[PDB]
Design an enzyme around this catalytic site. Structure first.
Site, PDB file in Angstrom:
ATOM      1  N   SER A 197       0.854  -1.198   0.000  1.00  0.00           N
ATOM      2  CA  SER A 197       0.000   0.000   0.000  1.00  0.00           C
ATOM      3  C   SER A 197       0.884   1.241   0.000  1.00  0.00           C
ATOM      4  O   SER A 197       1.700   1.391  -0.927  1.00  0.00           O
ATOM      5  CB  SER A 197      -0.991  -0.093   1.159  1.00  0.00           C
ATOM      6  OG  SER A 197      -1.899   0.985   1.118  1.00  0.00           O
ATOM      7  N   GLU A 324      -9.019  -4.708  -3.801  1.00  0.00           N
ATOM      8  CA  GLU A 324      -8.356  -3.570  -3.169  1.00  0.00           C
ATOM      9  C   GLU A 324      -9.325  -2.583  -2.507  1.00  0.00           C
ATOM     10  O   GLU A 324      -9.070  -2.118  -1.393  1.00  0.00           O
ATOM     11  CB  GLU A 324      -7.540  -2.825  -4.230  1.00  0.00           C
ATOM     12  CG  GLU A 324      -6.205  -3.438  -4.784  1.00  0.00           C
ATOM     13  CD  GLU A 324      -5.276  -4.176  -3.794  1.00  0.00           C
ATOM     14  OE1 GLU A 324      -5.233  -3.829  -2.597  1.00  0.00           O
ATOM     15  OE2 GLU A 324      -4.543  -5.076  -4.255  1.00  0.00           O
ATOM     16  N   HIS A 437      -7.553  -5.396   0.504  1.00  0.00           N
ATOM     17  CA  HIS A 437      -6.347  -4.587   0.566  1.00  0.00           C
ATOM     18  C   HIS A 437      -5.575  -4.881   1.847  1.00  0.00           C
ATOM     19  O   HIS A 437      -6.032  -4.531   2.937  1.00  0.00           O
ATOM     20  CB  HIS A 437      -6.761  -3.120   0.491  1.00  0.00           C
ATOM     21  CG  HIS A 437      -5.631  -2.146   0.486  1.00  0.00           C
ATOM     22  ND1 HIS A 437      -4.730  -2.047  -0.553  1.00  0.00           N
ATOM     23  CD2 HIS A 437      -5.291  -1.177   1.368  1.00  0.00           C
ATOM     24  CE1 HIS A 437      -3.872  -1.068  -0.303  1.00  0.00           C
ATOM     25  NE2 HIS A 437      -4.195  -0.520   0.854  1.00  0.00           N
TER      26      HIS A 437
HETATM   27  O1  LIG Z   1     -10.526   6.052   2.956  1.00  0.00           O
HETATM   28  N1  LIG Z   1      -9.781   6.552   3.996  1.00  0.00           N
HETATM   29  C1  LIG Z   1      -8.874   5.806   4.613  1.00  0.00           C
HETATM   30  C2  LIG Z   1      -9.316   4.746   5.620  1.00  0.00           C
HETATM   31  N2  LIG Z   1      -8.860   4.756   6.909  1.00  0.00           N
HETATM   32  C3  LIG Z   1      -9.276   3.804   7.805  1.00  0.00           C
HETATM   33  C4  LIG Z   1      -8.779   3.807   9.255  1.00  0.00           C
HETATM   34  C5  LIG Z   1      -7.462   3.027   9.305  1.00  0.00           C
HETATM   35  C6  LIG Z   1      -7.775   1.511   9.140  1.00  0.00           C
HETATM   36  C7  LIG Z   1      -6.867   0.928   8.044  1.00  0.00           C
HETATM   37  N3  LIG Z   1      -6.578  -0.455   8.353  1.00  0.00           N
HETATM   38  C8  LIG Z   1      -6.379  -1.373   7.250  1.00  0.00           C
HETATM   39  C9  LIG Z   1      -5.140  -1.326   6.491  1.00  0.00           C
HETATM   40  C10 LIG Z   1      -5.010  -2.230   5.455  1.00  0.00           C
HETATM   41  N4  LIG Z   1      -6.024  -3.142   5.142  1.00  0.00           N
HETATM   42  C11 LIG Z   1      -7.214  -3.192   5.869  1.00  0.00           C
HETATM   43  C12 LIG Z   1      -8.203  -4.124   5.538  1.00  0.00           C
HETATM   44  C13 LIG Z   1      -9.386  -4.153   6.278  1.00  0.00           C
HETATM   45  C14 LIG Z   1      -9.588  -3.271   7.336  1.00  0.00           C
HETATM   46  C15 LIG Z   1      -8.589  -2.349   7.670  1.00  0.00           C
HETATM   47  C16 LIG Z   1      -7.409  -2.312   6.926  1.00  0.00           C
HETATM   48  C17 LIG Z   1      -3.787  -2.309   4.577  1.00  0.00           C
HETATM   49  C18 LIG Z   1      -2.912  -1.087   4.692  1.00  0.00           C
HETATM   50  C19 LIG Z   1      -2.712  -0.680   6.134  1.00  0.00           C
HETATM   51  C20 LIG Z   1      -4.033  -0.343   6.820  1.00  0.00           C
HETATM   52  C21 LIG Z   1     -10.147   2.829   7.393  1.00  0.00           C
HETATM   53  C22 LIG Z   1     -10.614   2.837   6.110  1.00  0.00           C
HETATM   54  C23 LIG Z   1     -10.205   3.760   5.215  1.00  0.00           C
HETATM   55  O2  LIG Z   1     -10.709   3.710   3.891  1.00  0.00           O
END
Ligand SMILES: O/N=C\c1nc(CCCCNc2c3c(nc4ccccc24)CCCC3)ccc1O
Ligand SMILES: O/N=C/c1nc(CCCCNc2c3c(nc4ccccc24)CCCC3)ccc1O
Ligand SMILES: O/N=C/c1nc(CCCCNc2c3c(nc4ccccc24)CCCC3)ccc1O
Ligand SMILES: O/N=C/c1nc(CCCCNc2c3c(nc4ccccc24)CCCC3)ccc1O
Ligand SMILES: *[C@@H]1O[C@H](CO)[C@@H](O)[C@H](O)[C@H]1NC(C)=O
Ligand SMILES: *[C@@H]1O[C@H](CO)[C@@H](O)[C@H](O)[C@H]1NC(C)=O
Ligand SMILES: *[C@@H]1O[C@H](CO)[C@@H](O)[C@H](O)[C@H]1NC(C)=O
Ligand SMILES: *[C@@H]1O[C@H](CO)[C@@H](O)[C@H](O)[C@H]1NC(C)=O
Ligand SMILES: [Cl-]
Lengths: 532, 532
Positions: A197, A324, A437
């Site tokens: 990412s 994604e 994602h």
């Molecule tokens: O749109 N604005 C941005 C946005 N911010 C958030 C808060 C942070 C949670 C991200 N935490 C996750 C991450 C990743 N994958 C996830 C899959 C499922 C649930 C959480 C995930 C991969 C990269 C690292 C972080 C949620 C949704 C969003 O969309």
């Protein structure tokens, strides 16, 4: 002693940790910069000045100051990504897993975490390097970097807050590894940076930035690419948000010095509490403080560099996941719920389209809509859901990355492209969200090898196959072991554009990952929005 | 007698004609206007001055002065469309087939030939009406109108060449039917006008024109509709093509009187020989002299009229063929040939869409190209050929008609929609051309009933079913006999949008004929061209 290692900055004492009926060495929380505290918030990092005595490198360090996601309190699916350590501006530390006994001059892989440039930790359970380091006999390094405004506030012109410093934070950890990894068995000439990412885009930016190229050998990008629409912003725009952040805290705004000075008197969480208010639009998959194309870290526009071949010519292995964008719709679009199939009314689809391409004018929104709507069935709440799912995934990850893969491969020394589409048997998220994602990371890092995590037999086999691909690529530049019997992952070539599925079934070769949609995103729509 | 008929203009004497081991009555070459020659060239038709004695109405009239197609000399597939008797400006005649014995006040069907408003004839073998009149017990009229410059040269403002006089020719034939069809056993209160290509748009144009709405009861449109992009031009564009036509003949241009006096001096084929040099663009499916949006035949824009419901409210039955565009590409576009499969290279495809959408900027051509290119296979010559074929079909016929049918069905009193896709077994054109523009005409007119023509037993049934559909609709407003075991052709409605296939297999009902491509052609691309 295996656990006592003298580095260029001081002595370091690690710890024996168990992994799978064996053990390896771990050095956790090794400092690599001066704390960017006080009047050094927003400033470029300075090298950790050396210490006396022995650093206790047996505990994970603090996490950088970041927004904490509280959407679903206590839910494992979301909080596996949240800080698992106290937060502090004093966060610029790195972790090392070294096989035991220590290799002589072995391959080094350096992990860069994602989290949209506003969040992320090197200490998450799912980035636990002991499994990969032990299984593929590599030296594994988690770096860290400043996120959010602390890492990417950008007042082009100022030397107190120039921008891209969280990227310089990672460059500096890479330089640390260049000067010190030999002392752990690492070969500083065979260093693969990888990341997911925002971490993948970071990787791609170190490929592009001349100041970074010579600090690593090869590169892996997972669901991220330097040119992603969310991954950078222009000088003017980053100045806007920086000044807008000040206005949002009654900061004096006449000058950068006074603006910066106000924001440095603030408590971290006060910056974080308002961080999201500086975005230009109601957005999804957009972030406030990201790299800026500044003329220093990035000599020119990302696209002219890609045309001119102005980047490091090496081998790269990269790919994307099936769905994604689903996770971003869940958090930010109407009609989506973690507890339903999220069938999407037409009216909600129209709203999701608007929120998904922030920059499109009306004509561009009509193009997007047309491109993803089946007009024999425009009320089918599923096709409306999946359709807008595809929209976010294609716009933000897959198609930006294919543009990068094609541009790069014209000059690179070898490209390997993958499509990760396994949905984990033990997934905690609903079936509509798909291959999410970030959920290939747990296979990259060997977690399906822990019997108590209850992955299936073929998920353990897929994890071992993926770790080897990654590791064999990191050693040799080629995920395959040549003249060996397993089916051979082919090179992505300019003409044939091959790539492979990554899942529990036998390998399949396909060609032209998502051309139809990606021609729209990369060529037609930019022409459409440009015309006025 | 039964062959001697006293009309309000004079007596005509028809001839007894055989049809399918029987016989009926035919009145050929009945004059309905004064011959528009010399000083009445380009002028509105005047009604035929009455004659003394008995008009020999036993042989076909002359055909109007038109471009004669010579790309395939003596080849039956194109020769069947060319004039089959002497060409004369003295061509304003009509023909009537009456079943024998003469019915009392029965239903009247008036045929209007197509030919892109520059050509066509009432006297072609496929327009022979004896089969339709005999089989379905209808009184069948086929009219004529001036084509090319003779019929549609438009210098708005002038009353010497005002434009649309070919439409007024049609109107005046319709008015002759209103006034004299009762003496032939026709019911002037139950007249159905029908036509193909330019004839379909003509039918459609009479629905909209106020001066035409009372001269018929209901309407059939085959493969044409009033809003087709080739079927009208603005007064300014009409005047531009009229002055340019003068220029090509070094006519005096200082005034309409001087320009028109000059054009009335030239021999017909002098005009014809330069008629094509006035198109603004290298184009296919475009024609030099077509109806004008003058403010009088058409009081306001075709679109506004359709919006306000400013048209005749009744029952319409209409439809398209599967491969309308094939024929136009064969004559006008590279890579196409009558004796090969005409696989099309990417290059000829690009050239293709440029000729198909001559009014488009580069973003428009891009949009079209994106819309019809499979980028998993952008070099498949078949897919490229068929793609170009669909672009011409959809843009010029299908989607223009579908916009008309949706707009009309809001206000109309009943709509029936067909999709003709039977490929005649004895066709003389190559397979790649498919179901060709104009080639259901032979089924409307009962040609499969003739044993010598070498159709199949199932083609005769299709023709018999089509004819009965057409006649039954004309007599009742509904193609369905209302008992009639069979399979009922559903009404097209605003919401459910049902249509039927017309082929040799049992009738199927579908919804939203080519909705996906037609949203692009009717809503998106026009908005794009307007925006940019
Ligand atoms: O749109 N604005 C941005 C946005 N911010 C958030 C808060 C942070 C949670 C991200 N935490 C996750 C991450 C990743 N994958 C996830 C899959 C499922 C649930 C959480 C995930 C991969 C990269 C690292 C972080 C949620 C949704 C969003 O969309
Ligand atoms: O996707 N979340 C959706 C979302 N949540 C929240 C709850 C967290 C508080 C602010 N937090 C965030 C904000 C925004 N975008 C966020 C993305 C991820 C996590 C928090 C966000 C944009 C507008 C300003 C606030 C508010 C608004 C949202 O629109
Ligand atoms: O811009 N230029 C415009 C343009 N005009 C033409 C018409 C040529 C001859 C018409 N003759 C035929 C007709 C019809 N159907 C035919 C089918 C096969 C062969 C000839 C046919 C149906 C309606 C009446 C006439 C071809 C290509 C073009 O590009
Ligand atoms: O189809 N266009 C291609 C085309 N053909 C011809 C056939 C010779 C007679 C011209 N006469 C026709 C014209 C045009 N279209 C025709 C269609 C059918 C029959 C004759 C045509 C459009 C452009 C100008 C003249 C010549 C030039 C062409 O550039
Ligand atoms: C280093 O810290 C760990 C964690 O508390 C502890 O177990 C260990 O004893 C410490 N080592 C020294 C030398 O203090
Ligand atoms: C990489 O470079 C070497 C020599 O510089 C060349 O022989 C080889 O073919 C290249 N490989 C690829 C995949 O471009
Ligand atoms: C019209 O006249 C007779 C019928 O009275 C007919 O036989 C003849 O063929 C017709 N005229 C011509 C020139 O054919
Ligand atoms: C209009 O048509 C409808 C059905 O389409 C029917 O009520 C009737 O035939 C017409 N209405 C009136 C008021 O005549
Ligand atoms: Cl003039």
């Amino acid at each position: 002693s295996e656990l006592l290692v003298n580095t260029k900055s001081g002595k370091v004492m690690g710890t024996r940790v168990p992994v799978l009926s064996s053990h390896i060495s771990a050095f956790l929380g090794i400092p690599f910069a001066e704390p960017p505290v006080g009047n050094m918030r927003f400033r470029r990092p300075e090298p950790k000045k050396p210490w006396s005595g022995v650093w206790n490198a047996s505990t994970y360090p603090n996490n950088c100051q970041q927004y904490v996601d509280e959407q679903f309190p206590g839910f494992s699916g979301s909080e596996m990504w949240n800080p698992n350590r106290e937060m502090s501006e004093d966060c610029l530390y790195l972790n090392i897993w070294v096989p035991s006994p220590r290799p002589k001059s072995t391959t080094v892989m350096v992990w860069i975490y994602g989290g949209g440039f506003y969040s992320g930790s090197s200490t998450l359970d799912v980035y636990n390097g002991k499994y990969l380091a032990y299984t593929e006999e590599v030296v594994l390094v988690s770096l860290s970097y400043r996120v959010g405004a602390f890492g990417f506030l950008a007042l082009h012109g100022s030397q107190e807050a120039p921008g891209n410093v969280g990227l310089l934070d990672q460059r500096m950890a890479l330089q640390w590894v260049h000067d010190n990894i030999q002392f752990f068995g690492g070969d500083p000439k065979t260093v693969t940076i990888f990341g997911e990412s925002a971490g993948g885009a970071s990787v791609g930016m170190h490929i592009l930035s001349p100041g970074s190229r010579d600090l690593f050998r090869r590169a892996i990008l997972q669901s991220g690419s330097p040119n992603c629409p969310w991954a950078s912003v222009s000088v003017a725009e980053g100045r806007r948000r920086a000044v807008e952040l000040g206005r949002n805290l009654n900061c004096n705004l006449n000058s950068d010095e006074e603006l910066i000075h106000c924001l440095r008197e603030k408590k971290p969480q006060e910056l974080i509490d308002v961080e999201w208010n500086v975005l230009p639009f109601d957005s999804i998959f957009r972030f406030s403080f990201v790299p800026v194309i500044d003329g220093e870290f990035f000599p020119t526009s990302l696209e002219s560099m890609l045309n001119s071949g102005n980047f490091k010519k090496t081998q790269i292995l990269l790919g994307v996941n099936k769905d994604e964008g689903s996770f971003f719709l869940l958090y930010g679009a109407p009609g989506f719920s973690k507890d339903s199939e999220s069938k999407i009314s037409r009216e909600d689809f129209m709203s999701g389209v608007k929120l998904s391409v922030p920059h499109a004018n009306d004509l561009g929104l009509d193009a997007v809509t047309l491109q993803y709507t089946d007009w024999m069935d425009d009320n089918n709440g599923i096709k409306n859901r999946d359709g807008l799912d595809d929209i976010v995934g294609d716009h933000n990850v897959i198609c930006p990355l294919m543009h990068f893969v094609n541009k790069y491969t014209k000059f690179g020394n070898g490209t390997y492209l993958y499509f990760f589409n396994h949905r984990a048997s033990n997934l905690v998220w609903p079936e509509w969200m798909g291959v999410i994602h970030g959920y290939e990371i747990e296979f990259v890092f060997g977690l399906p090898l822990v019997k108590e995590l209850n992955y299936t037999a073929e998920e353990e086999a897929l994890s071992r196959r993926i770790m080897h691909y990654w590791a064999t690529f990191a050693k040799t530049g080629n995920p395959n072991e040549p003249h060996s019997q397993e089916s051979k992952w082919p090179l992505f070539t300019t003409k044939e554009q091959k790539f492979i599925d990554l899942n529990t079934e036998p390998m399949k070769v396909h060609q032209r990952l998502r051309v139809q949609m990606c021609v729209f995103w990369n060529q037609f729509l930019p022409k459409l929005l440009n015309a006025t």
